[PDB]
Design a protein around this motif. Sequence first.
Motif, PDB file in Angstrom:
ATOM      1  N   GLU A 215     -34.721 -69.672  -9.513  1.00 39.91           N
ATOM      2  CA  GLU A 215     -34.770 -69.613  -8.042  1.00 39.91           C
ATOM      3  C   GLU A 215     -34.604 -70.996  -7.447  1.00 39.91           C
ATOM      4  O   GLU A 215     -33.869 -71.182  -6.479  1.00 39.91           O
ATOM      5  N   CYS A 216     -35.320 -71.966  -8.010  1.00 39.36           N
ATOM      6  CA  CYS A 216     -35.252 -73.329  -7.505  1.00 39.36           C
ATOM      7  C   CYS A 216     -33.812 -73.801  -7.538  1.00 39.36           C
ATOM      8  O   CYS A 216     -33.279 -74.267  -6.528  1.00 39.36           O
TER       9      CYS A 216
ATOM     10  N   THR B 142     -31.494 -72.092  -5.105  1.00 38.61           N
ATOM     11  CA  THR B 142     -31.796 -72.463  -3.734  1.00 38.61           C
ATOM     12  C   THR B 142     -31.615 -73.956  -3.490  1.00 38.61           C
ATOM     13  O   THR B 142     -32.059 -74.487  -2.488  1.00 38.61           O
TER      14      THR B 142
ATOM     15  N   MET C 136     -32.826 -76.691  -5.063  1.00 34.69           N
ATOM     16  CA  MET C 136     -33.925 -77.617  -5.192  1.00 34.69           C
ATOM     17  C   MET C 136     -33.720 -78.371  -6.492  1.00 34.69           C
ATOM     18  O   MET C 136     -33.795 -77.803  -7.558  1.00 34.69           O
TER      19      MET C 136
ATOM     20  N   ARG D 259     -39.930 -82.161  -9.355  1.00 32.40           N
ATOM     21  CA  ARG D 259     -40.706 -80.979  -9.738  1.00 32.40           C
ATOM     22  C   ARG D 259     -39.825 -79.993 -10.525  1.00 32.40           C
ATOM     23  O   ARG D 259     -40.267 -79.387 -11.496  1.00 32.40           O
TER      24      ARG D 259
ATOM     25  N   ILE E  62     -41.277 -73.126  -2.106  1.00 40.37           N
ATOM     26  CA  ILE E  62     -41.958 -72.262  -3.053  1.00 40.37           C
ATOM     27  C   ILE E  62     -42.814 -73.058  -4.027  1.00 40.37           C
ATOM     28  O   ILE E  62     -43.859 -72.596  -4.434  1.00 40.37           O
ATOM     29  N   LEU E  63     -42.356 -74.232  -4.432  1.00 39.79           N
ATOM     30  CA  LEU E  63     -43.149 -75.055  -5.325  1.00 39.79           C
ATOM     31  C   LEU E  63     -44.436 -75.561  -4.654  1.00 39.79           C
ATOM     32  O   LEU E  63     -45.478 -75.611  -5.277  1.00 39.79           O
TER      33      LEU E  63
ATOM     34  N   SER F  36     -37.674 -65.095  -2.532  1.00 44.75           N
ATOM     35  CA  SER F  36     -37.595 -65.789  -3.824  1.00 44.75           C
ATOM     36  C   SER F  36     -38.778 -65.450  -4.733  1.00 44.75           C
ATOM     37  O   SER F  36     -38.605 -65.186  -5.925  1.00 44.75           O
TER      38      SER F  36
ATOM     39  N   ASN G 105     -38.140 -62.118  -5.898  1.00 47.92           N
ATOM     40  CA  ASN G 105     -37.058 -62.287  -6.865  1.00 47.92           C
ATOM     41  C   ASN G 105     -37.650 -62.562  -8.238  1.00 47.92           C
ATOM     42  O   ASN G 105     -37.306 -61.910  -9.224  1.00 47.92           O
ATOM     43  N   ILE G 106     -38.555 -63.538  -8.276  1.00 54.13           N
ATOM     44  CA  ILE G 106     -39.170 -64.008  -9.515  1.00 54.13           C
ATOM     45  C   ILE G 106     -39.962 -62.907 -10.218  1.00 54.13           C
ATOM     46  O   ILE G 106     -39.893 -62.768 -11.441  1.00 54.13           O
TER      47      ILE G 106
END
Lengths: 255, 242, 254, 243
Positions: free
Chosen positions: B10-11, B14, B16, B20, C3-4, C35, C38-39
């Motif tokens: 996902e990161c 998207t 990112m 991290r 999200i993080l 998201s 999604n995960i």
Amino acid sequence: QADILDLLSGHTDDTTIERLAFECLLTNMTDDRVVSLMNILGWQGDFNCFAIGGVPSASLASTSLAIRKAVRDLGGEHVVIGTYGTFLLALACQMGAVTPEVTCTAVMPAFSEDEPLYLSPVRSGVAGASHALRETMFSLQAAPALSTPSRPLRADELLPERALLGDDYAREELYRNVYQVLRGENPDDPTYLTVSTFLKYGSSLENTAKELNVHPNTVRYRLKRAAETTGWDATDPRDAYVLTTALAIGRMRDR
Amino acid sequence: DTTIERLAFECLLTNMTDDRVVSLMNILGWQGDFNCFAIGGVPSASLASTSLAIRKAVRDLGGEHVVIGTYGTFLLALACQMGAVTPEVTCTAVMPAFSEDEPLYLSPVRSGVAGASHALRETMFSLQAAPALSTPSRPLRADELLPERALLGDDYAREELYRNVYQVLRGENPDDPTYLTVSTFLKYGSSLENTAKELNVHPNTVRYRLKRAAETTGWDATDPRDAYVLTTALAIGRMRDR
Amino acid sequence: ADILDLLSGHTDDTTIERLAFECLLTNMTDDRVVSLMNILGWQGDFNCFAIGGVPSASLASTSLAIRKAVRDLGGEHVVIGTYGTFLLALACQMGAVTPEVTCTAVMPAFSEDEPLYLSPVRSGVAGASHALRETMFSLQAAPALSTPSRPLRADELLPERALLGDDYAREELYRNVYQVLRGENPDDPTYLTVSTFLKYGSSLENTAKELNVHPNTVRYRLKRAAETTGWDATDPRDAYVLTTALAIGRMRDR
Amino acid sequence: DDTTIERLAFECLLTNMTDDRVVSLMNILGWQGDFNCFAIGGVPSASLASTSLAIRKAVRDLGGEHVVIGTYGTFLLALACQMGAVTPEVTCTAVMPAFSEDEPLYLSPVRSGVAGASHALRETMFSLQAAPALSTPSRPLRADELLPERALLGDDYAREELYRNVYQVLRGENPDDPTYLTVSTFLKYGSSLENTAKELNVHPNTVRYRLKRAAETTGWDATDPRDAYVLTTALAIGRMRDR
């Protein structure tokens, strides 16, 4: 989340309040805090507004004075002014005699004749204000793609270039106001197929007629109808590029 | 294992690419400036089955790492290029896992986390852009859907149009009239005769210049698909440069 | 906050489930939630429904029983979380995981002494947030009613949910009761009669007098409104629902 | 400038911001100590400008020194500092001609300090939004007249008052007191004295008097349809809150 006092960092002067509201609107922030900032500036309730943008004729201070005076002379009392790159953008509250074409005419001399100028449609409330400022920003950034730009540039003149820059408003209009209008409610209606086929085949009446098994006059008639319903004439090279873009948007969205 | 992988996916999808995310990838075993590539399409039978087939196919090729995720109907897989894991070979091995009736895309090889993000995103944008074209290649060509990807917000497609088409067309020297001619030709809807009339040159001169442009850019302004690509590139270049 | 940031260094599906649940429950339907879902395996414009109530024995026990039931019905995904004393489960509807069957399957895992609610099937993250929230608000609203149904009816607690801040309940009162009854005709004889009747606290006599019609004329108009909206103004409960809808409509329309 | 500071303070208060930053801003505007204040709101009779002018002139004439004026939607709201002869009914009477006679007008109770000022402005805003629900609105609308509708709009002060000043007051400290049961049963049975009395094995008059006692403690008289609706709302609020 930051409240309006946080956002103001202790400032209470209206110049800072104006610049802050300007930046919020330009960055698509339309929440209650922005409503409060506009409230503080004097924009009450469900107001009407529009935006004008371009490059100042001589200077930023000079153009700003000219615009505030013009708005004043036309019976208005609110105009949010801000800069973006080389551009000056002004969001006027539509009240009294402050209407888009008349206001644009009144301030035109304060904008460089050698640079694009854009006049937005009327929009309502804080969300409309943000819309007006952003479509103005994206139109001005898109203008260099145009060979012979109108002055002022207006409305939906730059949809595809705006969409290429990532303007969601332009993508949505291409989808809703062009692609979906072409399709209509009746799926048996031949207009969409005819425009699509015409564009695909090189904007040739004959080749379109041949492909679709209809008379060339029939293709002609359908393109004219599509011009009436969408405002875009497939027989014109500029409009055909707009229509082609709309079809791509529509197809990617629907399948 | 699976959960961390999906989060990394996902990161990346998207966009990112900050530390991290690098750290997530480290945890998954993707170290330093790794090489990678992506493959995407619609599963022939199921997302689970296609995922498994890809993991197994990469493992058998000596690969240890793959990051798999979903975007709408599409299965997207990022593979670490190690051992015998190469794009074409991997693609071939996994084609049964992807439906013949839907588009398929294989990315070029890219590096690092920024590269991983680019590989997955160009794959997503390409698959999303495909319906715009009547008869795309399978797998989709890298240069096939640039205007459409750009319209979706693919910044790498914008850059490619800018660098490989617009700037190539414009050239080093201002005196070369090839650019002006192509520009004018497109403005007049690809009318040879209106372009010759407007430039006050012989139509043969126009034809010659268009051919030159087709040679240097790979796009032929006399073809309506190519003309659209060219028109898009000029717009992008003009907005960027002035 | 990305999200993080939301995750705070957690990479466990349990924290991710809880985070997704909390986002949904607080009406967050943005890209980060998409998201997160999604995960967890919830891809695209999925269909889902919610079941909620108080666990018969324990949260752990009810959770286990729900996951078992959903899997036995051929389901793959269920987001389970808690709010106050309530356990809420959002199930992806697929295979034989359909609302009534699922609800019947898991009823034994919920206390008989406490309300139970099953939402309608909805779609996407926005639908999931709606389903979880209407479930929460319905459970919270139930004590206002002396002998509500089990599970609670979707239309049974509209004013009470609206009072708690449930915007879906306000909307449903506006669209399904007020608008259906009024239309563009503030002067329609049925609408006017219902309005006046409520204004006079459901007094047939006082209403007939005020409108200068026969009581029987008031009666058939209320009957019409009842058939049209499902709410009978001669019933004190129904009258309260109607009064609430009219207030909502009036405040909204100016 | 001064207008700017004043509008900022107004927005903060309207938006329920009562923190030290707001207190300090009100202090700079001249609102100091545990001041008393109240709010009046409605639609300007002619214009925002002229209503504001008339309000400030009235407050000045009444010996007051501080008014904070702002807008919400079509509404003008004014917060007045209670001092000199600036008191709620007198001030309201002085400024009423500045508000449209075709639109609702509301006068808040007196409140204390910056938290009170925020409370007065919000109960005024919500009451004005809720006014269209009312069939025969008083002019001005006052106090707790619109509690249930305000609660419907999400006004936390209304929800709280419904619980504290109505539902809790009905219940009191004595479970032997029949007020709550009687009000509750009466509403359940469609405001029928006869049927309520039959249910409770008591004479209709005993029911009537118990309801009148409730009217004394809460201000709400269940024999009146308006008040019955308010009371029904308070019971719902209370029952949801205590389980």
